[PDB]
């Protein structure tokens, strides 16, 4: 019975291993990787998609995260850093309530039922954006850019230079219509994004594809405050249900409840504030019956993120939530380590 | 700064292993603990008053805890046991919260409101008494009587004897009027209490003085439906002051939110059953808007605690926790050790 | 006779190791076990077909085990993961009564004599189906195709339009009429199972096999209750076997009768409750007279069988049950080990 | 949480270690002890009254064993030895139900039960005895004289002098008015017992009294199949109550079961037969519906034991199992250990 949970649990060790790397980059304040290899180049990154394409995985059970972080970039490009995130903050949550003595088991069919109801309110709290002049956009671009505007500019405007209706199609991608030349100006003709250097086009041209992504998604799935606060939102209710549901199954519920705070604290973490004051201080406004306000990341104060501007697309919250909860299911069902034939 | 928390886990594991040895005994299906001495003698025994009375005591912090809850006998007569294994669990999750870097100072003043709160809300809960015919104070005096009737009936008898008016007065102590002897039978003339032998005089001497306080402040104070069904119904809204409380000072008012089910899991767990599911299962009645709803101590199944017939008096709960939060906010105070001139 | 005995233990334990490995795997709600390479591939699986296909075995007495779990295999294609390990429960409970002091020869014969008493009464038990319209025909199509809709009900709707006599046809199999395609739909041409990509292909068309197989078992020898009920209800009647049984070899009786009850018992720990105590409560319920008394797998609570519509085929416990006891019987003869040239 | 177990498995050891220091003198070819001193003194003893009233003991659960054992001596003068091998057998299997998993206080109250039960079957089971001329009067006195003829006829000699009520009376026992001098003859004047020598006194004296308590509890309550048939015709009822138990509780019952065939399991290993198989047997034989069969302690053939003559007395064996029940449970009930003043 020992070595059952230590297989959970060295599993589990691999995941965090993953998260804790690419955890600190998280936010609009986030910090950035050493990489290293034998030979000794330096790669500096804080996007997580590089992170975990250049990270050394060795350990079986680190793998399949990867592999579904990357999926979310096969769906639409975007958020594979906070489903890490919150995948490994569910699955040390779930192996806290093991610890505490609740079965596998039952962590599992209640994480399932956590993770349903934050799907569905997420779904619901996110508000749709009315046309593409609206100023959302041009937040949702700015955040998408790492806070540079020139590159949030170009995006929204080929953006509105398309339409709505162009944009709802399922079969066209605006990743695949951005492209980075070195020593030219920022038009959009196929936009081109003009670099300094040949070696400054490579991060140039992915954080246009985070931008183009971001307004992608934001007119089909809509708006949701970003900064951590819907996932605030969503955990005061599934709270609420895990003090609904019956019996020991509950406890996934609670972990659902507790992992879905992690993104917030370590937006908060990453600003250089103490988290766990930051997000007492947070609940006085959320008392009000509004759900859609944080903490801005550069005074420490409470404020509302529709006038803070702090925006992020539904669909990649969504679906990193989506995807968090399958795989902390997926590892969490393991319970023993077998050697092949 | 590390020896000013070294000093605080020091008094704190004093306290809880006066609370680990003396937790075992809460409920009606409680354990005993057996003392030895040097000359080999022993001494069986389910109180908690005689257990922390003849214990050797040798760290200054938990002669304190003993010195608070013996001070509370001497009030009331009863409910040291519930005051020491609350104040156990309330300084257990004090250094808690310590350990995830909470300011002391801040867990201290957050007790303190914490456990206010929770006093009022106890004495409002508290339902009082129509008359001494009430069948709740012969509930009250079979659970002070370890569930033995014969000396349940004697103590009520002979109250109706003494009346009302003449009972609240102050300087009347009903637990004075108790004399047991060996080989006589019941009755009243002083309440004779028969033995068998000198040697069972002890304690059925000390269990006559139980019944007789429970049934001396049964009136004063009314009732409480007890078995922990009422600390966890005030829980229940220190939690909810918990989230109406501002900053990093509202860790202690989950403290004491979490402090207050520590009786109801020590009973669940002494009568053999999982407290986990258990305290999950039970928080299904309280969505019906009542708040006198526990479990039931042989066959573990969710039943009304008014019905259920496990009764205990409001003003020994009510000195309990007030005892626990004085002596919980005086135990987490102390930072440092110094020795004397 | 310690090396004797040390010889048969290190054999137990072999049988004990393979069986513990797929034991988490067994019932609705079992646990998935990761095969890992030198190389550091993956396959994440909960059947047990494959588990035991792709691990090694290298002290012999597994491969015996293994060779007639396969063996089992052939003829029906479902319940080798029951049949392994109720061979290990059989001879784990064996060696424990050894070690008591019996010899290994009285239990080998009680070994049989309960074993073949236990699939009398596991024959007897089984009912037939009515007809192909009964929606047994859907329960037990359910319940192998991992509780997946899509897949029951093509498998069930193409069994309706094979017939009954000709699914009767021993020389008939029709596992290999089911085939899967990646890209395509589910519909009856052959049955065609649709899948998404061509990696899904692979354990799509394993689990069509699987559920084909169950709903050709139950034609040809009828329904029992799943759950692991059926092996409880025939138990008992092992119980009152051995108590008719003179002299020691009665003891392999009792190896019988605690052996079936490990199907139940790790259905219900794998499900995350207690085994002890949702055992204990089931023989309570038993007191009716009726048989079909199993355990729910996610709230826990007793309902009789048939009305939770989780139903497995009779041949396929059947024959488990007779693998199990001939395994159990060979694996315990063994006394010595020896080397060739 | 193992410390709690710790202890008690500490007071179950001192409990098994007594009786394990007591099993060899059970039954009518029973084995000596030997005591010792640091100045060398040694008595050969195989009455275990003489054992328990002069072995050391310093660990203090046994003392509480000794006293209650001993308890019983002072109700009637005989049957000590039985009451500390069912205190042992319950004891230990009251430990390894705890070891599987069952908390102590389900294992405790389904010991009560269980004891309960036994004692109400027991009651039922003790028929009486038709006049004083019967030959089972004869018969007990023979058991209890250590197979010797002499002294068992001048018990029944003096029986019928006193007379019927006279010895119903419960003010009046005949084990004091026995007396033993050296020199003299077989005669009742005051039942004169002759003796050799000066030390041939005390054990002639301490038989005496022991054959002349065997037949006052055989007026006084009637006779039981000894041998230790009569716990096995109790422990089948026991176990039929233990399917009958709803929940955890029933592993006491099962407990209570198996710790009433420790009795005759002694009494076969002491006679040199293997138990296991004369056990078997002996249960294989009970088909017939009686309560009266046992096994012969010369030849290990299965013979009824009222035509063998060995009986005992049913008022000894009630009061034996209610100290051994009592002494069980107490003991079970202690968790936890500690040093006074």
Not at 155 to 181: S, Y
Not at 301 to 310: F, I, K, N, T
Request: include cysteine; proline fraction near 3%.
């Amino acid at each position: 019975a020992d070595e059952r949970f230590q297989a959970l649990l060295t599993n589990v060790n691999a995941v965090r291993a993953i998260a804790d790397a690419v955890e600190g980059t998280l936010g609009p304040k986030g910090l950035d990787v050493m990489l290293v290899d034998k030979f000794g180049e330096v790669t500096i990154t804080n996007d997580g998609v590089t992170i975990l394409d250049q990270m050394d995985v060795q350990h079986p059970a680190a793998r399949m995260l990867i592999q579904v972080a990357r999926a979310q970039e096969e769906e639409v490009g975007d958020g594979t850093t906070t489903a890490t995130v919150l995948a490994g903050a569910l699955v040390s949550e779930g192996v806290n309530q093991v610890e505490q003595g609740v079965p596998v088991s039952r962590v599992i069919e209640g994480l399932r039922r956590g993770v349903e109801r934050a799907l569905e309110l997420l779904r619901k709290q996110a508000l749709p954006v009315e046309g593409l002049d609206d100023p959302r956009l041009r937040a949702v671009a700015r955040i998408a850019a790492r806070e540079r505007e020139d590159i949030a500019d170009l995006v929204v405007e080929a953006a509105r230079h398309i339409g709505e209706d162009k944009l709802q199609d399922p079969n066209f991608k605006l990743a695949d219509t951005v492209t980075a030349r070195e020593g030219a100006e920022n038009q959009v003709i196929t936009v081109l994004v003009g670099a300094a250097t040949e070696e400054v086009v490579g991060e140039r041209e992915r954080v246009a594809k985070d931008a183009a992504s971001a307004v992608q998604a934001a007119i089909r799935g809509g708006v949701v405050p970003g900064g951590g606060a819907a996932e605030l939102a969503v955990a005061r209710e599934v709270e609420k249900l895990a003090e609904e549901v019956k019996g020991m199954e509950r406890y996934g519920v609670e972990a659902v409840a507790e992992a879905l705070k992690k993104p917030l604290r370590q937006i908060v973490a990453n600003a250089g504030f103490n988290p766990l004051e930051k997000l007492g201080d947070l609940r006085a406004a959320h008392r009000t019956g509004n759900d859609s306000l944080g903490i801005d990341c550069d005074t420490g104060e409470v404020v509302d993120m529709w006038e803070a501007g702090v925006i992020d697309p539904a669909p990649v919250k969504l679906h990193a939530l989506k995807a968090a909860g399958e795989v902390a299911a997926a590892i969490l069902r393991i319970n023993t380590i077998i050697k092949m034939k």
